[PDB]
């Protein structure tokens, strides 16, 4: 219908006319990115009338229609400043059963209003900072956490579950105090690991790689985003024994799904979310990755399993080709790989025997080629301070943390990754590697490594002291604070 016609009908109040008009309007118009100005004034007045009738108790009949109309209204910025009042947010919350009135237990399963109110909440919080700072004071996180906890004792539909998970993700990502409130006061990590084990339960005990359905993959990715947002703080090094146990539990839950695949093409997104959550886990917990029961046909190395390490290495391989958002893609992978390789000799030897082994190449610059070694040493010269440092640390821990063995490839990588403190790593000097190259090690200038081009000095003593005028050129920059 027309916005002006609906707005004019909103003043009459005919029960069997205005509701049919709203229904026809929702049936006709139901897609985002509407008009600009022909809807600006009239639909702004319509949204004012709607928020006024929403600040009062609205009609119990056709509640889904009211919420659908308000949801469609909440997609244009012109009305977000109107719907983001504390009264309107509390009304949409109590309609979504996520308000502060925790006394009404989730007994009525009237989902038609629940899912629409959750959609409205998501729409408002994702694009209205005032709505964020209002929901942070109304404390909607507690009831959402209670609902997520009551997922086994009461089976909720997929849509409501996914939409409240998305609402929780938006709320914990945008508001800062919500993160701490859900971390300490709500035991968010435990509840989210519970929800993750609940999602990863489709045909349980699948010994090979388990395939995840669409809905399960979606909800798992959402709860992984929530965990990443809630965990990255105050988990640097020191934690309690029970917290370390819970973190090892979450690490096993993520290990059992990194090797797994999802339906469609969301495999890479799910794996990236798993790696992002892995990055936040404490260092000493990551040892639960390499520890796995060596089954039949599994990747064996040093008498221990390496399927998950090889899986995340191939994930780094497939992920390095996203050159745009490269700072968010491979840096957590490199971080978790370093931290699970620094603590274990089998992982260290595996990475040294699968990342930078080949030394008998035709003597050329290592910063060229198709190898993973060549790609990493090319990345070492990047313009992002977050990715060159982590790659430097990776190639450092791979060379058993040895500077003379670090200059294995270049002499500038040391210049890139030196003086980067936060050192009792495992030092090993047992195996020695020599090929036809290291007999020619005498002809390899160290920063450039093995180019064997020699040129003479050209001043010839006629003007060496005159060539020193460049010293007078450069001396003007040495003195710093005062001439004096």
């Amino acid at each position: 219908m027309e916005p002006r016609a609906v707005a004019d009908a909103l003043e009459t109040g005919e029960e069997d006319a205005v509701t049919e008009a709203l229904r026809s309007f929702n049936r006709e118009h139901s897609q985002s990115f509407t008009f600009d100005d022909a809807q600006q004034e009239d639909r702004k007045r319509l949204a004012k009338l709607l928020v006024s009738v929403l600040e009062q108790g609205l009609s119990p009949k056709h509640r889904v229609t009211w919420l659908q109309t308000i949801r469609i209204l909440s997609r244009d910025r012109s009305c977000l400043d109107s719907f983001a009042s504390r009264q309107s947010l509390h009304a949409l919350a109590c309609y979504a059963d996520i308000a502060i009135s925790e006394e009404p237990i989730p007994q009525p399963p009237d989902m038609d209003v629940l899912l629409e109110s959750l959609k409205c909440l998501c729409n408002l919080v994702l694009s209205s900072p005032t709505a964020q700072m209002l929901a942070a004071e109304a404390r909607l996180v507690v009831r959402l956490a209670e609902r997520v906890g009551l997922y086994r004792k009461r089976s909720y539909p997929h849509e409501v579950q996914f939409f409240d998970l998305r609402l929780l993700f938006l709320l914990t990502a945008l508001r800062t105090d919500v993160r701490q409130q859900l971390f300490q006061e709500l035991h968010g990590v435990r509840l989210l690991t519970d929800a993750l084990e609940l999602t990863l339960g489709v045909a349980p005990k699948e010994n090979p790689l388990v395939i995840l359905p669409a809905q399960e993959t979606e909800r798992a990715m959402e709860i992984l985003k929530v965990l990443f947002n809630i965990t990255f703080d105050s988990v640097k090094r020191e934690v309690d024994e029970e917290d370390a146990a819970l973190y090892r539990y979450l690490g096993t839950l993520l290990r059992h799904c990194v090797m797994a695949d999802a339906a469609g093409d969301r495999t890479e997104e799910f794996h990236g979310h798993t790696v992002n959550l892995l990055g936040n886990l404490p260092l000493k917990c990551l040892d639960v990755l390499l520890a796995l029961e060596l089954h039949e046909g599994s990747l064996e190395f040093m008498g221990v399993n390496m399927d998950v390490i090889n899986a995340l290495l191939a994930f780094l391989e497939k992920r390095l080709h996203q050159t745009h958002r490269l700072k968010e893609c491979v840096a957590p992978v490199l971080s978790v790989l370093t931290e699970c390789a620094r603590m274990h000799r089998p992982a260290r030897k595996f990475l040294k025997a699968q990342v930078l082994p080949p030394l008998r190449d035709v003597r050329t610059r290592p910063e060229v080629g198709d190898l993973l070694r060549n790609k990493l040493v090319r990345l070492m010269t990047h313009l992002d301070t977050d990715v060159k440092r982590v790659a430097a640390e990776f190639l450092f821990v791979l060379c058993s943390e040895s500077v003379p063995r670090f200059i294995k490839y270049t002499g500038y990588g040391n210049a890139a990754g030196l003086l980067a403190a936060r050192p009792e790593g495992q030092y090993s000097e047992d195996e020695d590697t020599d090929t036809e190259e290291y007999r020619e090690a005498k002809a390899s200038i160290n920063p450039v490594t093995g180019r064997v081009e020699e040129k003479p000095p050209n001043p010839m003593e006629g003007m060496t002291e005159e060539q020193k005028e460049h010293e007078a050129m450069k001396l003007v920059n040495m003195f710093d604070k005062l001439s004096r």
Partner: nanobody
Amino acid sequence: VQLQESGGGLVQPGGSLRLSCAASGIIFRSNGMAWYRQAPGKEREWVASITSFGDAIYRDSVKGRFTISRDNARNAVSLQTNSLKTEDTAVYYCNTYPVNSAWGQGTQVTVS
């Protein structure tokens, strides 16, 4: 939600014993069970836990001496205690590791 334990106690240093735990009223395939250790005092230690799969996690004090059985399709969980020391005397409970529901009765374990 009904938790019930079985088996425990009556052993000397260097003996074995299987502690079982029957869980009913709730889903079993998606709940990660755990074992808790109530020492004779005012503390409650954590023994070990397992996931929905056979993935097990032991305590550093019981590493290499205890093992947890799952027995899927059989609504119960077992915990083997082997080569116990003089400090392993306590009351033991079973509960879901992610969600700590109501504790049950528990079984006494005595090393003497």
